Amino acid sequence: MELKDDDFEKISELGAGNGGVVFKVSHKPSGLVMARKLIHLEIKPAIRNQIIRELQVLHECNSPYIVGFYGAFYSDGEISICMEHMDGGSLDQVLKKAGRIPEQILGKVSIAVIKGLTYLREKHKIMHRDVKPSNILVNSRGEIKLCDFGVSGQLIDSMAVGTRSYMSPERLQGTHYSVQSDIWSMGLSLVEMAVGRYPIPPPDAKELELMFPPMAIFELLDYIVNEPPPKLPSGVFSLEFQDFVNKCLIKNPAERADLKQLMVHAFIKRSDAEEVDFAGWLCSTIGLN
Amino acid sequence: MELKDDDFEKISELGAGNGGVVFKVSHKPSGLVMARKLIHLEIKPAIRNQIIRELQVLHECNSPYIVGFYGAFYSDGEISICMEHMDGGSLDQVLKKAGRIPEQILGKVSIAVIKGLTYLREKHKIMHRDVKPSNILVNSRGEIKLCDFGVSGQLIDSMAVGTRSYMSPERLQGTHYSVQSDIWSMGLSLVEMAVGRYPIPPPDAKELELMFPPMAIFELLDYIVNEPPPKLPSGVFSLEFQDFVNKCLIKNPAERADLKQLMVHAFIKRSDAEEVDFAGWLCSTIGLN
Numbered sequence A, B: 001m002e003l004k005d006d007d008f009e010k011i012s013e014l015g016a017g018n019g020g021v022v023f024k025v026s027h028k029p030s031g032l033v034m035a036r037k038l039i040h041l042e043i044k045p046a047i048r049n050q051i052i053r054e055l056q057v058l059h060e061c062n063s064p065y066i067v068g069f070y071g072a073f074y075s076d077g078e079i080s081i082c083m084e085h086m087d088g089g090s091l092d093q094v095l096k097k098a099g100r101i102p103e104q105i106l107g108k109v110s111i112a113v114i115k116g117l118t119y120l121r122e123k124h125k126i127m128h129r130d131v132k133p134s135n136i137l138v139n140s141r142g143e144i145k146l147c148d149f150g151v152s153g154q155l156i157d158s159m160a161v162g163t164r165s166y167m168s169p170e171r172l173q174g175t176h177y178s179v180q181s182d183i184w185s186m187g188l189s190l191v192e193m194a195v196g197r198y199p200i201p202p203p204d205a206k207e208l209e210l211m212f213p214p215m216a217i218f219e220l221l222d223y224i225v226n227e228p229p230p231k232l233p234s235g236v237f238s239l240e241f242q243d244f245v246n247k248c249l250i251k252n253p254a255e256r257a258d259l260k261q262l263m264v265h266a267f268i269k270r271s272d273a274e275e276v277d278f279a280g281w282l283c284s285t286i287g288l289n
């Protein structure tokens, strides 16, 4: 069925940031609860046709690790992307409440991210481009899915920050970046969720004991590309997880682990095995099910 | 009269970017054409009262060089700032069409900016914080006014980028910045409008002759704080304008010119004297009057 502006009805507001507003909506003719993302864009008719036509490939994006897509269209000054409503929200949202996402669970996250990235690369020849806790979605059925990946060249162009950056050193420095940049993003995301806060600058010997000031735009980006990469605090995380993130946060794109190598890493092998009630942990900490 | 959401009616859309949408609207009970800025904010009732109460000082901001303020209020997920409709739009908008704003005119711009900054500092003890071509507004009566200055501490907090930066070296580096940061912003704005493009990185010897690739976030900010400041191309601009911007773009906050010193600089003295049809030049280049 073809999606249309007058066929929708706002329920609530799921969040916003840097270009998009997403509402929990209801598709009147189908009865389906949906998440609708609106991106306000002052765009000429000809090249918003391109964006809509380019977003049609999302119909061919089927994977348990990728958010379902229903439709995309343009309506008076906004393009609409209609996707599956994830009732658990984003990992950045569950982190606020959790305070800290346990290593066991983060392993189930890593698996999903690595499988999601892999699907997009192998079957669609695209990198994600914006991997961060807010672009990773969860639900009550325990599914962990990626959204907001780069399907549309022209939409990337049309929008082209803040004070938190998950961009790789090579991407911050120039145009010489590619799929390996997503590994850094995942790597850094996993450290953040582990310790409970954005891991740059690293916490001091006192803050380390405490848990267990805001940085300026240049101070932050300078730290990323020049000062040694963030590490997982030792002792309280397994040597398996540590090696995983360390291999992820290698500054050099070519020295850095890839999806292939990460898929067969000790931590993932260990995480595939483990019997964990994700849905249980998720709903119990966010008060849902 | 007290401003209200149901009392307004959308005419057109004037623009958007990084938090705000501004519509040309009509205030039904007064008949006044207005510019209404909406800032979408997920904010607790208690601290959106603060923002609204803090924006009331804008009622006491009266100056020919500051955009008129009518009212501010909150309405279902957005705070509204209602200001004078400037029919000429922003300097960044007139630059697109002009291609280059003549030195003579930029002198009338400088005067307004320096008088606008001065008013805000002396009479209200506030710095602007976001001086750039888009925050400088013009109209058909030839008025040149500033908007989007920092009246509200809590609103600054609530919003706290892109790929063009007008932030001073000291502000990009830390919290050790103040009113002198606005001078850099003005300084850099004036170079941009003069030559026709954002002046970092500087144009090469070939591009200089031609007129008369996009930079990554770190490459750009690294250039600002480390590499020598931008200069006005010699020969085709007066020695008076050159010294003005040079004195504005001194990397050191304390070595940099202030509002006092700039007010009595040769270029402003010269610009105060000159008889220029701004309204004429403006309307003629943007097709209005």
Ligand SMILES: Nc1ncnc2c1ncn2[C@@H]1O[C@H](COP(=O)(O)OP(=O)(O)OP(=O)(O)O)[C@@H](O)[C@H]1O
Residues within 6 Å of the ligand: A014, A015, A016, A017, A018, A019, A020, A021, A022, A035, A067, A083, A084, A085, A086, A087, A089, A090, A093, A134, A135, A137, A147, A148
């Ligand atoms: N399909 C969805 N299901 C449930 N919640 C969603 C969905 N899509 C987005 N959200 C929620 O809406 C919020 C806003 O997402 P949006 O993509 O607009 O910005 P963001 O990813 O949070 O941050 P940024 O703008 O910095 O990328 C997310 O944090 C998420 O909690």
Ligand SMILES: Nc1ncnc2c1ncn2[C@@H]1O[C@H](COP(=O)(O)OP(=O)(O)OP(=O)(O)O)[C@@H](O)[C@H]1O
Residues within 6 Å of the ligand: B014, B015, B016, B017, B018, B019, B020, B021, B022, B035, B067, B083, B084, B085, B086, B087, B089, B090, B093, B134, B135, B137, B147, B148
């Ligand atoms: N009072 C006004 N009168 C006429 N036009 C306006 C007025 N206020 C804003 N505009 C127009 O709306 C546009 C959007 O302004 P807004 O403050 O939302 O973002 P911006 O200043 O353009 O860019 P940024 O978001 O990067 O600061 C401006 O470029 C300007 O042309």
Ligand SMILES: C#Cc1ccc(Nc2c(C(=O)NOCCO)ccc(F)c2F)c(F)c1
Residues within 6 Å of the ligand: A017, A018, A019, A020, A037, A055, A058, A066, A067, A068, A069, A081, A083, A130, A146, A147, A148, A149, A150, A151, A152, A153, A155, A156
């Ligand atoms: C399932 C699904 C799904 C995939 C992509 C986007 N959106 C985007 C975004 C995007 O949403 N970026 O983040 C917006 C705010 O940071 C950017 C470029 C692009 F081509 C897209 F298709 C989406 F919505 C949903």
Ligand SMILES: C#Cc1ccc(Nc2c(C(=O)NOCCO)ccc(F)c2F)c(F)c1
Residues within 6 Å of the ligand: B017, B018, B019, B020, B037, B055, B058, B066, B067, B068, B069, B081, B083, B130, B146, B147, B148, B149, B150, B151, B152, B153, B155, B156
């Ligand atoms: C006349 C007038 C006038 C003065 C200030 C703001 N707006 C702001 C902004 C603002 O608009 N920033 O830019 C928004 C997008 O970059 C930020 C902080 C603050 F306290 C304000 F009052 C405005 F609207 C109009």
Ligand SMILES: [Mg+2]
Residues within 6 Å of the ligand: A134, A135, A148
């Ligand atoms: Mg997102």
Ligand SMILES: [Mg+2]
Residues within 6 Å of the ligand: B134, B135, B148
């Ligand atoms: Mg503005």
